[PDB]
A paper describes a structure:
Escherichia coli phage vB_EcoM_CBA120 (CBA 120), a member of the Ackermannviridae family and the architype of the new Cba120virus genus, has four tailspikes encoded by ORFs 210 through 213, denoted herein as TSP1-43. TSPs serve as primary receptor binding proteins that allow for the initial reversible contact between the phage and the bacterial cell. After binding to the bacterial lipopolysaccharide (LPS), TSPs exhibit glycosidase or esterase activity directed toward the receptor/substrate that allow the tail fibers or other receptor binding proteins, which lack enzymatic activity, to irreversibly bind secondary receptors to facilitate host invasion. TSPs form highly stable homotrimers, with each subunit divided broadly into two main domains.
The structure was refined at 1.85 Å resolution. Subdomain D3, where the tailspike catalytic site resides, adopts a right-handed β-helix (residues 169–574). An N-terminal three α-helix bundle imbedded within the core of the D1 subdomain incorporates a metal ion close to the C-terminus of the bundle along the 3-fold axis of the trimer. The cation coordinates six ligands in an octahedral geometry (one Asn24 side chain from each subunit and three water molecules). The octahedral coordination and the cation-ligand distances are consistent with Mg2+. However, Glu362 and Asp383 on one subunit and Asp426 on the adjacent subunit are in close proximity within the intermolecular cleft. This result suggests the two essential catalytic residues of TSP3 are E362 and D426, located on two adjacent subunits.
Numbering used by the authors:
A (entry chain B): 13 to 628
B (entry chain C): 12 to 630
C (entry chain A): 12 to 627
Write the structure that this text describes.
């Protein structure tokens, strides 16, 4: 019966029986709310835009209702009103869609087709394999689909890029732009983002660094407070890295037993300045190893920084390096090794600098390096503190000597087993205001300069050293003013084969201050009596010193003492044959052949005695 | 039976039994049934649970309120609770009346119900917002299309982060941790990118991004990129206490134009007094660059500025009336520091620009009217000069004799500078200690030149391979020069012009022929124009091969005197009988060139005697 | 028939054709039909697609399990997959029995289906959580109301960030990047605000926020705000290796009360030994302040503390038994540093407080029993004094003669201090180089005062316009003073009291009348009480206008001796026969005032000779 069918259709759409009609080519649609196609057995809501007299024309399988007025897609209107038919079966069985309001199930979720009809779906299809999802293709419909899509997006990583973010909302801030939460979160990189974990050896964080750097990331932070094990050697750093610890809590640590293991490399492409790789910063972290390693190897590099780094058994090795700063670092069993033989052009490295560092058992060993500078540092114990060497050495006339400057200022060197300073090839150096107490364990000088030229060593204190406080060997044309040499085992200041040095002011002796000293037996000694041009002026010697000065001050040596306490001013004296050849006017000479003083008279051009008589 | 057929199709619709559907009729017992039908309205509604036997139907209105024996029930309300709805034929656009709570009206392919009082009339061309809004007591959206559109809107319009509650550490419960929003937590940091910044090499004007970020109240601003942030709008005023942080020295803030008068940033106090100086801030870990030479920052009436790990390229820093500025771990290429004080109309002095651990190439430091410039542990290479000081007000009035200010230069290296490494005018109370200077070769200039100096100390420096003298002092007085080395300079080691009361002690002069460069220095110390007085040389170790070790007039009236300088005569007391000193110290020894003998002043006899103790003739 | 009619009604509901609906009857061929009807339960169900011809029906139970000749199918499960549901009468609160997977039961205007064993009896008064829970195998929410409510709860209850998966760089696929959660990524950083901190000027007690933040294990804590964070609970103990980071020096951590005994933070080791010292941390980029004077931090038994770009106001730092502490780029206003060591019951010493690039006004540095205080590149203005050192344990036993410690003061400026710039007691091995001092004018005090000094060097400093002497040395021995300038001081340049064996070399004294302030200095160098010995002046350039250049007893027994100081006579060896030196070097020259002649020593004969060679 048509009446009962119209009636149950009315119940479905929530309308009145009076308001339903069968499509019939020639009816006045006006007034009806729902139309029924008896051929397809589908019902459709009618557009509110229906005027009396508009009569049917043709109603097709696509539910396109052609009437007198114009035409209407009843399927499209049905989607608009969320009035759907869920087809039997599924994408897997396949089916054909003819109307915009037909749904097809895939995996317990429904889809409608937004493209051209009819749409045939072959058996074994999925929405993706049959047009994909989007405007003009498959669009998901309904509860199950929305739930799955939300669960999937939240759980698969895609959600943060779909959330728009703007700084300061809900406040409207002039100039703030829309970004995504993904973008904003990506403003920072932690090692953890690349699988890093401070789990004390379970994770190989070497690979996390490698991957992080390969992504283009440069500034990498450590979240943890524990030990990040490193197990793959020779990770190459990118130019201008910055690795940031969590407030000096976490360690980047090698936990193995291979002393050849190296954590990181930094490598330029060749020896010239345009080939040096730009370094970066390590800060606020511990670099450590249970065995001694060279933790980083830099070759052909410039502008490296380490700030607030704690190094444990981890030596830094650089070869052909240019400007490196260690600031506020703590170095335990962790040497600095600088070389330049890879610089095949000039055979030089430049400016390793240490500021506000503390070191224990951590020597600084630089060869063929210009302008090593150490300022406001404390170095404790170790075999030695500072060593310099020159491996070129062999000069060609008119050059007479090869070497480089160090600058060492207001630093403390204490309880070093050997020399605090073992400086070979020191040229134009300035060494000012330091405290040195070293060498006791090996009966070594506190400081030893072998091969020095044109340098200044000013205002330093050498105390309680294992031999001399300071020994100068093969040093020329250099100044030593205001230095104190106290309580040293064998002597204060010693020279060997030096030439043209000034030793001015300061003081030598023993002051017996609580905390350690020897009774120093010698002040200044030219130990092998073979220096010339050594000038001592104004030095305050402790009267109790057994030997204040040992120095040959005979007339041809050019060695001379003036106003040094407990030592006479050098007197020109000698035999008649050793009278000077070109004396200044009124020159006074004590003639040991005659046993009298004599004076050079420049007008007569003769030596005379005190009574005015010519001698000779 | 048509009633029965209708009852049946309704039972199918609700999933109930056929006999559980009842028509409304006044008086009928409602117990047991599940669904009631209104024959007038032609609507069905689920009945509420628990209608006990005896309850009889009384009335049912167009709003689907059912009245019965034991009370009443809003069947529209019940239907909403069970998500049992009717979608009316219209839309908000054609207009409709809403009579019951479970009727839905379509707006833009989405459904809404009315949560207000009923009936609800809706004129054509209405919307949920125009007809009472959306929320409790008004329109509430219902169903799939609505929820999908609202979620899409929410997620895409920026409001979502503020709705997500966040607490640090969850799901762990951390004592003291508070609830915030994701929005809040994300806003804890500001990147230039948040205000439109982009390192796209000139497409974006990042000057505006800085201006907008600062105006928001942001102070600490980070750069995310590794490329070039182009700057195209001049004179962006910095707030007090900014911090601009680059991405590990990778990105550049760069001027790409051709106007050499462009300036990126200004920092400007409100006047010249200390409580009016604007508090500066920090630039760190980045490159400040320009293709043409510019003054990239101009500070006027400012205090407490820091630059740390900044690489400057063609970018000069210009400050006028400034107080305490630090450059630390900077790399300065073609990038001058220019300090002035004429805007300080109170004292006309600026204070304490300080450089530490810097490397400079072609980047002079040029300060006028500035007290306590300090350079420590720095390297300066090339350039026209490295350090220049000047005093504008060379205007003193007696009893004042001189005007100037101190510099402190310590353990720094100045190398291959084309002119003077140090060009110091008006240098007073300065300390210059432990430095290396090799400068002036390209222009035949002194390594260092002090013109107008008072009461200063220059100690333990090395001047080597300089283009004229290592160091020249002109109009310097009451100053000490101890332990300095002067090696292999073109013309001489140390020179004086019109100086007074200087001590030159120790150190050494000569040439040591070290591989890397030197001249054969022909002169040690020279009083170049023979017009200085009170110049005291003591204990200086001269290379014997020096042609002229000392050039100095040591006659009695000059007060110039030499003692223990190798290869140089000591200044001896000597002269004619007429020139015997008038008030000699006790036992004074004088070589009398008239007599050709030494004589001694005896303070007891009050006479000059020879060595035999006889008085010499003396009127 | 009514069966025909019911089938038609059902067909409309499912959107199928009338002949595609079938009643379950045992034995029927099921193929071809789309919907089946159970006439007993009066429920309809979609049939699964593709039942093959000849598949005959066996049974259909109250669970809607359809058993047939080829197998069985759960039509309830299929209904769920197609979102074809029945909403039961009633609710969880009234109770019900669930028999089929596609039955829904309402609770709180939301629907649930049962995913567990059927049937499921729900007792009256139930809720989903009370009647089995929500999740797989239990209750599962269905539909619009439920989903809306669940979305609102999940965003608002704090659990959402941990549910959102995150990976760095998406949608780009970055090798090595791992999945984390948004919660994890946000938790990478800690602000004080996360623990309730607020810069609301006293309303919030931020002391407690810090306590809670550190108790969580967090170490690096950031301040978001630019205002005042009030602190109201005293003695918050810092963890080891904290880092507190201000917002670019804008915010203040401030005490707003009136109790001068209030202390913000403590850092406390477990005892005096090196393995018991607590590792400190960093404060940076912030203001520490109080309206009344307080000791804002108290450190006891501590090592490795840093303060960088901190502005201190009325806030003294007090450390007792401390080892290595750095203040860099700090501004100190009315904010003393107080260093002590009496809590070190082992050695009674503290070590290496260091100041670099600091500015201070009215903020003295007062350290007792402390080795190696170092001040470099600093400026100190005003205050009662700038730098003070003291020794508590002054008494010594033979062979010790003296107790004290080094200070290192380099290239720093001390100006307009009311009393002494430097008040140094027990100064041993100190190096004081390249400083500028102008102090004491307000109290007629010396610019610098060293009382008890040994084996130290003071080089290349300038002392100008001080309130008495530029520098006074009292009880100083075996020390060097080279290249210093003493200008324009009220009473004198350099003074000594009870000293022994000092060298004073070069530099200059006088007044240069430079605009900006000076006195007319009346005295150069003075041995003020005429009781020092072994004082050696060499090469000092004195202003000719000085009224008294040198005040010093240079008689033969005092070992005091002047050479080449302008305007001062050179010291001549002279005196009575009784005071002739015993056994001096050969040809030593002495003016014998008893005989009124010079005489020369002949070492071999052990006799004095006159200039004619005769014994005297
Ligand atoms: Cl990062
Ligand atoms: Cl690699
Ligand atoms: Cl003569
Ligand atoms: Cl602006
Ligand atoms: Cl006499
Ligand atoms: Cl606590
Ligand atoms: Mg129906
Ligand atoms: Na290796
Ligand atoms: Na307290
Ligand atoms: Na007295």
């Amino acid at each position: 019966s048509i009446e009962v069918n119209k009636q149950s259709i009315a119940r479905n759409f929530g309308v009145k029986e009076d308001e339903v009609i069968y499509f019939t080519a020639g009816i006045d649609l006006s007034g009806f709310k729902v139309i029924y196609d008896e051929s397809t057995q589908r019902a459709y809501s009618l557009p509110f835009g229906i005027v009396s007299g508009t009569t049917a024309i043709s109603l097709d399988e696509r539910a396109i209702l052609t009437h007198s007025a114009g035409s209407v897609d009843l399927g499209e209107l049905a989607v608009s009103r969320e009035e759907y038919v869920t087809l039997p079966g599924s994408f897997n069985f396949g089916h054909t869609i003819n109307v915009k309001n037909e749904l097809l199930v895939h995996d317990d979720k429904k889809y409608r087709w937004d493209g051209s009809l009819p749409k045939v779906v072959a058996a074994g299809s999925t929405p993706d394999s049959s047009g994909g999802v989007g405007l003009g293709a498959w669009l998901s419909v309904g509860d199950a689909a929305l739930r799955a899509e939300l669960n999937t997006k939240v759980s698969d990583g895609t959600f943060p890029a779909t959330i728009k973010y703007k700084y300061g909302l809900p406040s409207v801030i002039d100039g703030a732009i829309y970004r995504t939460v993904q973008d904003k979160l990506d403003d920072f990189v932690f090692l953890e983002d690349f699988g890093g974990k401070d789990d004390a050896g379970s994770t190989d964080n070497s690979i996390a660094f490698r991957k992080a750097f390969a992504s283009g990331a440069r500034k990498i932070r450590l979240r943890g407070s524990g030990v990040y094990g490193m197990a793959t050697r020779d990770i190459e750093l990118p130019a201008k890295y910055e690795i940031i610890g969590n407030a000096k809590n976490p360690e980047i640590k090698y936990l193995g037993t291979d002393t050849s293991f190296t954590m990181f490399t930094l490598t330029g492409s060749g020896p010239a300045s345009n080939q040096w790789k730009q370094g970066g910063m390590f800060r606020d972290l511990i670099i450590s190893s249970d065995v001694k390693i060279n933790w980083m190897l830099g070759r052909h590099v410039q502008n490296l920084d380490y700030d607030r780094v704690f190094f444990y058994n981890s030596a830094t090795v650089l070869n052909n390096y240019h400007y490196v700063n260690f600031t506020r670092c703590e170095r335990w069993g962790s040497a600095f090794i600088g070389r330049a033989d890879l610089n095949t052009i000039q055979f030089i490295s430049e400016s390793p600098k240490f500021h506000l560092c503390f070191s224990s058992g951590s020597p600084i060993d630089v060869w063929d390096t210009a302008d090593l500078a150490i300022t406001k540092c404390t170095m404790f114990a170790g075999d030695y503190a500072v060593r310099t060497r020159v491996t070129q050495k062999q000069v060609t006339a008119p050059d007479l000597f090869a070497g480089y400057p160090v600058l060492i200022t207001c630093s403390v060197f204490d309880a070093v087993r050997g020399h605090a300073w073992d400086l070979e090839g020191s040229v134009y150096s300035t060494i000012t205001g330091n405290l040195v107490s070293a060498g006791r364990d090996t009966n070594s000088h506190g400081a030893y300069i072998k091969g020095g030229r044109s340098l200044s060593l000013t205002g330093n204190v050498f105390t309680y050293c294992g031999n001399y406080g300071l020994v100068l060997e093969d040093v020329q044309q250099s100044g030593f003013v205001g230095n104190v040499f106290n309580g040293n085992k064998t002597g204060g200041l010693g020279t060997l084969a030096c030439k043209d040095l000034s030793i001015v002011g300061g003081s030598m002796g023993t002051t017996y201050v609580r905390g350690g000293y020897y009774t120093q037996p010698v002040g200044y000694s030219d130990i092998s009596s073979n220096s010339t041009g050594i000038l001592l002026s104004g030095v305050a010697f402790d009267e109790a010193l057994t030997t204040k000065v040992y120095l040959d001050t005979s007339i041809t040596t050019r060695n001379k003492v003036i106003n040094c306490s407990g030592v006479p001013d050098t007197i020109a004296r000698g035999s008649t044959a050793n009278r000077p050849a070109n004396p200044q006017a009124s020159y006074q000479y004590y003639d040991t052949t005659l046993g009298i003083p004599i004076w050079w008279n420049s007008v007569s051009g003769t030596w005379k005695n005190a009574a005015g008589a010519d001698v000779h």
